[PDB]
C-alpha positions in Angstrom: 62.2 68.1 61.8 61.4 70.6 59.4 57.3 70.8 58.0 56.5 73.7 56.5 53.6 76.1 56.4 53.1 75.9 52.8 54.2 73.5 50.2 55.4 76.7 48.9 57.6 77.5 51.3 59.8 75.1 50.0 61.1 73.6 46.8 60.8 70.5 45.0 64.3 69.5 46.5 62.8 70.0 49.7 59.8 68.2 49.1 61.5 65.2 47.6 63.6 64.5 50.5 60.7 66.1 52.9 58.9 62.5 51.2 62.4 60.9 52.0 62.3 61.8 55.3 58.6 59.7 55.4 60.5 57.4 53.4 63.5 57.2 55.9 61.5 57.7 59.1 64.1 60.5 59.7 61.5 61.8 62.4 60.3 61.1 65.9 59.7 57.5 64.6 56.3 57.0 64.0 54.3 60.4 64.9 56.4 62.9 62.6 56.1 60.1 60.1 52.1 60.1 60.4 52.5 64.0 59.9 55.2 64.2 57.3 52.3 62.0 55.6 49.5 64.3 56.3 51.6 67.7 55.3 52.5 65.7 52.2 48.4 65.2 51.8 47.8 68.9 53.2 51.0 70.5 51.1 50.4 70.1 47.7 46.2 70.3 47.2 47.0 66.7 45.8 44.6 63.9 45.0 46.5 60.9 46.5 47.4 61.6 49.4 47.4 58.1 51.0 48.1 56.9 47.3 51.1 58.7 46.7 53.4 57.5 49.3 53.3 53.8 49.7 50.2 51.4 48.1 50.8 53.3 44.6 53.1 50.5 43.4 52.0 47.8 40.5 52.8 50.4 37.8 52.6 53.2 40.0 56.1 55.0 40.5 55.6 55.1 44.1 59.7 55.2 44.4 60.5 58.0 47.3 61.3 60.0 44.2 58.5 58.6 41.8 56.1 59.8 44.7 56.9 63.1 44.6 57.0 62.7 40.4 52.8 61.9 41.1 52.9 65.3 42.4 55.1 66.5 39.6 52.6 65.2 37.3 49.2 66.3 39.0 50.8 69.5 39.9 52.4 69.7 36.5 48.8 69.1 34.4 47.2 70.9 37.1 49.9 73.4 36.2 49.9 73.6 40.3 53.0 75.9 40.3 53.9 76.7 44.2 56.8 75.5 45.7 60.0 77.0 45.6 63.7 76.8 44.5 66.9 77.2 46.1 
Protein backbone atom coordinates (compact mmCIF):
# COMPACT_ATOMS: atom_id res chain seq x y z
CA UNK A 1 0.00 0.00 0.00
CA UNK A 2 1.44 3.03 -1.34
CA UNK A 3 0.83 6.69 0.88
CA UNK A 4 3.04 9.14 0.05
CA UNK A 5 5.05 11.86 1.72
CA UNK A 6 3.55 14.60 -0.17
CA UNK A 7 0.47 14.94 -2.10
CA UNK A 8 3.05 16.09 -4.41
CA UNK A 9 4.81 13.25 -4.74
CA UNK A 10 2.28 11.99 -6.80
CA UNK A 11 -0.20 12.84 -9.49
CA UNK A 12 -3.71 13.37 -9.85
CA UNK A 13 -3.92 9.73 -11.36
CA UNK A 14 -2.45 8.71 -8.36
CA UNK A 15 -4.50 10.48 -6.09
CA UNK A 16 -7.71 9.49 -7.76
CA UNK A 17 -7.20 5.94 -7.43
CA UNK A 18 -5.05 6.63 -4.00
CA UNK A 19 -9.17 7.86 -3.10
CA UNK A 20 -10.13 4.58 -4.99
CA UNK A 21 -8.14 2.55 -2.96
CA UNK A 22 -10.34 4.27 0.32
CA UNK A 23 -13.06 3.76 -1.96
CA UNK A 24 -12.20 -0.03 -2.61
CA UNK A 25 -10.75 -0.79 0.79
CA UNK A 26 -7.74 -2.06 -1.35
CA UNK A 27 -5.74 -1.85 2.09
CA UNK A 28 -5.21 -3.74 5.28
CA UNK A 29 -9.10 -3.52 5.59
CA UNK A 30 -9.97 -1.10 7.88
CA UNK A 31 -6.66 0.64 9.35
CA UNK A 32 -4.98 1.70 5.90
CA UNK A 33 -8.51 2.75 5.08
CA UNK A 34 -8.65 5.13 8.31
CA UNK A 35 -5.17 6.36 6.97
CA UNK A 36 -5.65 6.47 3.22
CA UNK A 37 -8.51 8.96 4.73
CA UNK A 38 -6.25 10.93 6.93
CA UNK A 39 -3.35 11.26 4.07
CA UNK A 40 -6.26 12.25 1.84
CA UNK A 41 -7.10 15.09 4.76
CA UNK A 42 -3.19 15.60 5.40
CA UNK A 43 -2.23 15.52 1.42
CA UNK A 44 -3.82 18.12 -0.18
CA UNK A 45 -4.06 21.32 2.62
CA UNK A 46 -7.92 20.66 1.78
CA UNK A 47 -10.92 21.86 3.62
CA UNK A 48 -13.07 18.73 3.64
CA UNK A 49 -11.36 16.26 4.64
CA UNK A 50 -14.11 14.09 6.28
CA UNK A 51 -16.45 15.91 3.65
CA UNK A 52 -14.78 14.89 0.65
CA UNK A 53 -14.91 11.22 0.78
CA UNK A 54 -18.21 9.88 1.76
CA UNK A 55 -21.21 12.27 3.56
CA UNK A 56 -20.60 14.88 0.61
CA UNK A 57 -23.51 13.33 -1.39
CA UNK A 58 -27.11 15.33 -1.88
CA UNK A 59 -25.58 17.45 -4.66
CA UNK A 60 -22.22 16.93 -3.59
CA UNK A 61 -20.09 14.83 -6.25
CA UNK A 62 -18.75 12.68 -3.69
CA UNK A 63 -18.28 9.88 -6.67
CA UNK A 64 -14.66 8.17 -5.97
CA UNK A 65 -13.80 10.46 -8.84
CA UNK A 66 -16.08 13.45 -7.98
CA UNK A 67 -14.17 13.41 -4.56
CA UNK A 68 -11.06 13.92 -5.80
CA UNK A 69 -12.84 16.68 -8.46
CA UNK A 70 -13.63 18.67 -4.66
CA UNK A 71 -9.96 18.74 -4.58
CA UNK A 72 -9.73 19.69 -8.18
CA UNK A 73 -11.91 22.49 -7.49
CA UNK A 74 -10.51 23.79 -4.04
CA UNK A 75 -7.07 23.13 -5.34
CA UNK A 76 -7.94 24.53 -8.64
CA UNK A 77 -9.51 28.10 -7.15
CA UNK A 78 -6.94 27.83 -4.56
CA UNK A 79 -4.78 27.50 -7.67
CA UNK A 80 -3.14 24.68 -5.10
CA UNK A 81 -0.84 23.41 -7.84
CA UNK A 82 1.31 20.35 -6.26
CA UNK A 83 0.95 17.06 -7.30
CA UNK A 84 2.46 15.46 -10.06
CA UNK A 85 2.15 13.79 -13.50
CA UNK A 86 3.28 10.70 -14.99
Amino acid sequence: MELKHSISDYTEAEFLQLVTTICNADTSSEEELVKLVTHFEEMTEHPSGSDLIYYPKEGDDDSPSGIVNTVKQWRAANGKSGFKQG
